[model samples]
Target: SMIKQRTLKNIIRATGVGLHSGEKVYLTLKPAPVDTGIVFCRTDLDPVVEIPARAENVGETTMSTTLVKGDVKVDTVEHLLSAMAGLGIDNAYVELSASEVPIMDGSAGPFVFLIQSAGLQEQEAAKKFIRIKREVSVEEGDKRAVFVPFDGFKVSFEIDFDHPVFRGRTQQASVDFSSTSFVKEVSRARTFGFMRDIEYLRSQNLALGGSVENAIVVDENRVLNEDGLRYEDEFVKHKILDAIGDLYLLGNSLIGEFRGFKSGHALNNQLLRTLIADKDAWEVVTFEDARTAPISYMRP
Candidate 1:
């Protein structure tokens, strides 16, 4: 089932240093009207600028998702976008005083905290989804991602790293929106990296090179981050967060099942292209009446 627009009940704000800039950055969330999906506003400039969160606006960054509009761009939006999607938000205007959103010490946790503090307001609107009409799959060497029609949004992914530490843990995870809770389970998982690559000397930018401050640092056989892992399989769950944000670029929930086998951003981005290009593979759909809907919506 489709839903009415859910905006903020209050204008909430927070401050942090840009994950890469290391400069004080202002982040604000303002309620928005219908038809205007989630968007970003960089108010650090004179005239201000905007970068809508949409599939086509995403850059081809295998490291992270960057929303670009000409020379104006917003970087590292995956975590925040995932939080918004999980909260069932339809219109929320994000204002930032920097080019990139703060990486949040590494996950969507803080973003969820801010939203919870402000509460949410609702409105009537005909938002829609790109319903998969046929089974479609894409590949990259050993990686694969697929989208098959289903009544509700679902994503199941499996990841594998040829490393001892990874082999000691879970490698497969799934988030079927119909039953799973995004904020409680997926948002707490942190992004990760390895120490053998000598990532300490150069973490000035937000990439594979990172510290225990922003990612799960692992040695040949040990996890170097906080008191062990937030979850036994936090590594795999974080990838669930990654896929949620990447798919959010479609600007609406996907009514179908997505299965990724040893895949990441590039494969997800490519699937977006493949699904949208084939006219018979998907269809635009909505339901004005909750009772008229053929499929159940994500849990409230």
Candidate 2:
């Protein structure tokens, strides 16, 4: 509860494949000074362009939350962003050898492992949060995402997929971010895709590296992976994971309740932008220590 700015304890490196590009990627996670936020660097670029991951800098959300600054861009950032947010990382430098982040295990699991292995260190500055002061909602007909004044970072999501393999009764999942062990409860949930969709993406020269090794591929009847689901409601939990990462674009943690219905990267980003534009709806606050924050700021 003694919330403070945080970064990885040490520099770490890994290599993996990008889900869409099918290219080998080299990645490095380095600790940053206070207030640096999450910055993405394209190390392979001629000039090594840097893009700060922020809500306003997001220029694409078709598949994943992509951070863009002018011509330079970073694609497929949600999984890694989700891991950082789940672990309460406030500042870090993500150096990538390609445009998109590697889709390790197609979930936040491997990312979580990377961060944990690097450990975490607290900076001498207090952690700031965007505390919701009023209710805010964004909608695009059937798609919806809402943020309400709540004491913790709670998320609830729902979907109405009619696939035969999908359980009708378990189409929704919720997480109390303040108390839940994100590594245990949400990190391992892998992204899912329909076989037809994957085929379409491959035909379009995308999802070139996607396979059973990364994503939980589902056919018209059932899952295609040799191993089954990792969680009872992995589908919706993955949605929850993406939602957290999308919201992390704010560059600061939030204290509120988020509810979504068939929402994805786009709607979540819209909600954050809309909430932020309405300055009266939220305020930035910092806690002195665990005594003042109590169960409010999550413990590392």
Candidate 3:
């Protein structure tokens, strides 16, 4: 399951509208040599500021995880980051023309497609992974997220909600990312919003780019979109989708099982902070071959 460190082979750019700003934004993916990791640059500014997508620089995770340094900020990047991590990418440069990434199709689908189109090029350096040594968890209020030693990258998530449509029962889902499974099962789970929340967000000058084209909208008792949920438990699946991306704040793939219980951006990021603060909880290692690691690491 050990995979090659990858980055875009060439510069690939795309233009789309930000879900919150409602303005068109341009994103360019630039290749980086081994050890560069993933970074963001603001191309619109004169100085061209840069921010590393590392936990130490994670500024906010309110509605979406945001990374900021001085005047430059990037929001709603978990989906794109998740795509990169899920695909085994270790380094790249993400240049954005705005403070947030474009929310294409309200899912990681567009990002996945863009990365595939750009194509992955292997680098010479060995990839780094945070191999979990034991159970590590973080909790805030009623939510929590945890990671434990496992053979491969696996996620088990549970979401509890009180919406009229999805009230009372909790949804559960688990996935082991291998052989493009992350691309197929997790990348296309679109973001979700409530009809009432949309109005409130609009009142606050948020979600200006939100539309039926990007997200799955729910009313009092049912989904408002013409196309409904892709999976019966798409809600939980999307939670896992967000977790994979947010966990990338650790700056490397985690070789363990991540479990979430009604957790969102806040608790997930906090979990990374906790792990980093307690260095003994995890260690970075390179898996040279499947046999050198777990079976999950051997899979594609």
Candidate 4:
């Protein structure tokens, strides 16, 4: 049952509004050759600049992870990346007509559905993994992200929001992908924001596309979204979703345990850079026996 690389069986298309810019964006997912990785082609540019989804190209993480190559930029890519990783997508070309990926429903659910619609095709090359060999970590004040040795892929996250709405609820969640369904357990968790913060961003003419329809909006005392949370601990689950997408920026499936505490995009990118620079902290491995690989990554 040794797993191999996978790509889309057919091209899939979708359109939505950018999370930050609020402009309509068009996206297409197409199959790619082995080792092509996840590449973003900016169809809007006259020359069509291409950018690989990698940690080193990450230029900003203030509100969302933005990829920059020279003057061309792609913003808010985590939700889409999360869906790709969640579904074990290994090779594909993402073409877009805007500066950012569309924010469909503020979660990875729509992306997952789109990818599934394209269907998955196993490739000839064996899938690669960055298996942690030693502990690697990064910290910025109280926020931290760490990678530790583990036989299978897993992510554990914790958050402590001072807001009352986040109190008296699960602030921590752990998912061992070895036995979990990422799409079911994590993809539907929407990005969340406090009402005050959303107002502040909106005052600056930012987050213009944000509304109850795409994100989990919370006031001082409770969730403002009429449907409430998709999960009791959707906050931390969303954090894990972000972590999964962030980890994928390493350009491979990571075989290890990721632990995060109040960590965001910046910290996650830094942790990956640190681990990669060490060389000794991780090794590229391939599973020859499907039984030996993380169950979550294998096709059911």
TM-score-wise, the better of 1 and 2 is: 2
Q: What does the lDDT come to for candidate 2?
A: 0.87
Each candidate: RMSD: 2.6, 1.6, 2.0, 1.4
Ranking by TM-score: 4, 2, 3, 1
Please estimate how well model 4 matches the true structure, expressed as its whole-model Cα lDDT. 0.88
Please give the lDDT score at residue 260 for candidate 3.
96
Candidate 1 per-residue lDDT, tens place, 186-262, comes to 88889887777655434545453246887888888888865778888888888888888888888887788889888
Per-model TM-score, in order, reads 0.90, 0.96, 0.94, 0.97
Off by over 4 Å in 2: 294-300
Off by over 4 Å in 1: 20-23, 198-204, 291-300
- Model 4 clash pairs are none
lDDT of 1: 0.79
Question: For residues 52-149, could you state the per-residue lDDT of candidate 4 as single tens digits?
Answer: 99998999887888899988899888989999888888889999999989999999999988888768999988988899999999999989899999
lDDT of each: 0.79, 0.87, 0.83, 0.88
In candidate 4, position 219 carries an lDDT of 83
Q: lDDT at 152 for candidate 1?
A: 81
TM-score of 1: 0.90
Candidate 1 clashing pairs?
none
Better of 2 and 4 by TM-score: 4
